[PDB]
Amino acid sequence: DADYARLVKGRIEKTLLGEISEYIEEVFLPDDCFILVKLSLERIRLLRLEVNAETVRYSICTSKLRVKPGDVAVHGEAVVCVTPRENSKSSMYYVLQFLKEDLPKVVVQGIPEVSRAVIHIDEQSGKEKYKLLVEGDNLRAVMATHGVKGTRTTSNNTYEVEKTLGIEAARTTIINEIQYTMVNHGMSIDRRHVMLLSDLMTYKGEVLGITRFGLAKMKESVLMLASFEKTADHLFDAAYFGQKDSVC
Amino acid sequence: KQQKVELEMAIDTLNPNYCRSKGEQIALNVDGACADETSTYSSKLMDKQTF
Amino acid sequence: DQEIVQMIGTEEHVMAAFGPSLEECQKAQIFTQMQALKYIGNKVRRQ
Amino acid sequence: MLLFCPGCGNGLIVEEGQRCHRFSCNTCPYVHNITRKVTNRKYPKLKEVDDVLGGAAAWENVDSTAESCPKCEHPRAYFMQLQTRSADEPMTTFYKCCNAQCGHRWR
Amino acid sequence: RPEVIQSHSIFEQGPAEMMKKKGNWDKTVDVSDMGPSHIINIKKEKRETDEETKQILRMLPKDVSVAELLRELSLTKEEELLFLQLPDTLPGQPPTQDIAENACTLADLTEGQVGKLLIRKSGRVQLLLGKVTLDVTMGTACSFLQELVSVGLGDSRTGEMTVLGHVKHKLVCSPDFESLLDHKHR
């Protein structure tokens, strides 16, 4: 049911601090000045996010102009205050005008690489179950959030699958993705052709392109390399290295 | 002819909005410390605004 | 700086967007026309 | 917020003096002592709530002696009020009725 | 920094957030009723929209030329300096000025009555300045300070400068090209 989907969607989909705060305000007092953020805890309670004032202190202090943990206070469950400090590098203490546009865009919850996520619905009569579609580029993180079945998630991107699951899962993804694209345009190819293409791309342990850079890692012959692209550079390198070319 | 008006207006110094510590510095930058033959500001502070 | 921002626009979000550009010129010593023209002079490619 | 000097019209910066925090010009002696609380509220845009309440959410606004919905004339319906944008918006009222052989959405 | 931060199901009380927020910034050090601490109420800093100068405090629609002239006649008998823009040529001849059908300006005419100003029903305003009637409309609403000043070089090297008053409203006069053309089309 959908109530479980929206929880784990909210664990991967990025939300910014500004998206959950009903206002942010600068306060200037005679004794001190600070920036204050009040969290809209009603909207937290609906979106089923596991964040509060004590967590927002941990969303800040990471990669934000070396702000100190002491400078951030959690005076109530709904409020946070960020006491500004001198940047002491190409800046003026008036850096509040930087934070007032930057502090909302800090990420409090979720995965930073995920731009959005959507719930998808099946239409078969036998069943109804919800799969989650993630438009983003961190496969490892989505494999490791509580409540995603990590053994059955997949990716379009062969580089992500290689970095996360190894060369043999990347090899299957080249097969699946070429065949998916061919079937949609109503073409059909015997599986043995896309199989051979993927095995040529992965036999040296790394996913090598069909570009000039991949071909230079696969092919040893100078005259083969010089008869495709960069015809000058390959011939001067063979002169320098004194390479001998198999005419095979 | 070629109408170009200039005005000079006096700003007071006993009102709280004048930071005299900074006013002494800016007047010392503009005028040499004790010369006063030609000088934009007669007193040790920035007395005047020119328009 | 006021007459510049008057021309660019006086809505709050237009001022917020232009804000970091005032904060650049105030870091340099450029407060006067002659100082600004000197700055441009040291950037001109000589023909 | 941008605040500008009455004298020369350069941009003010906030600094600290010996008795108060001050707005101060960089190019003229003008300073303005912050004597009392001054503030500036951003009010940013919140998330959409449309697909968040659908599908038997954890609503709670129902109360004893609540009105019946106008079509079915039974109290088998939930009602709620929420801000759709930031909290300066006047809250909107919305309600949904779910009964046997009867599905509807109303305003 | 401890990462495994803990949370609970309980619902925040509305006043409890309000009164916590209240106690965070309602503190005031205004007790210093002293000269330095004091502040001049007529030299506040300028908030950027000039109609909206007051950012700190002790605690619009557009007018039309029928309304402007009605306020200065009935509601307030005080005199006020308008500033008006006329067309490039008035419907006159330069009197004996040694010409060529050259432009006619207010500098060429002589003192006296020059015309009549009519307010009509439905807010139409006309400046009847001869046989012809010119239309009058409100100009851009300036809200910076404007001063109307005399300069008189009463001597070869010295003279008097005198401020006669502030200027608030601008009027634009233009020819009614539709009426001029509906007389004799082309």
Place this chain on the structure above:
Amino acid sequence: DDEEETYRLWKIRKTIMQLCHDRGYLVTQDELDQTLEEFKAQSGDKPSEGRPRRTDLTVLVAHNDDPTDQMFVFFPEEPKVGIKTIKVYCQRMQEENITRALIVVQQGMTPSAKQSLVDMAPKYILEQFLQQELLINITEHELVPEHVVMTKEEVTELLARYKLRENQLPRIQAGDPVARYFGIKRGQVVKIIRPSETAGRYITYRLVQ
């Protein structure tokens, strides 16, 4: 939280047990089937539960080859582990005369510490794992085939059956996740059992290089 943090310390421990079992270390049936509500008994919630030195493993002896060949698993608490903490774990490992260890870092490892693991000794080999990799057993993922580390007496038949040299086989990197999982080193061969579209199977081979 505290519900979520214990969940990781159960899933990470569960995967390390299956990793040690697949490498051929002696693992007991009650370690592999340790249930979440059963994990709560020896070590409970976060105040009682200790991460740096309670969940450590050393019972793992290489029961196939020899009971003296033994391996640690360590769970540091600092997200970026410096050389100091490595030296701490190394001298404890030096005292016990254990030669293998796993270090399970929480966010990462600082560059000067990473360089140490290459050169501390060839006879003291330590493998970095990020815990974010151990929350999902990749050997049970649907895209990963069955890998089987071949014996030298079987590699000598592979090369005899096709009349190959070793350097004509396809390659697999040592930096591959599934190569790290089985802990294989340069010059070992892995058998890979790819599933067919039919009931059948296709067998392929790769060389670590």
Place this chain on the structure above:
RNA sequence: ACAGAG
């Protein structure tokens, strides 16, 4: 160097 053809 431009236009064509499939």
Place this chain on the structure above:
DNA sequence: TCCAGCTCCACTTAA
């Protein structure tokens, strides 16, 4: 008109 390598420069760890 689009895209991999190469080099310069700030940014933490570590002694």
Place this chain on the structure above:
DNA sequence: TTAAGTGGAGCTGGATGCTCTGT
């Protein structure tokens, strides 16, 4: 305090369909 290994940003050099048919 600083030696050094590695992040992030700008510069540079490469590539972009097959043929006949005429001026």
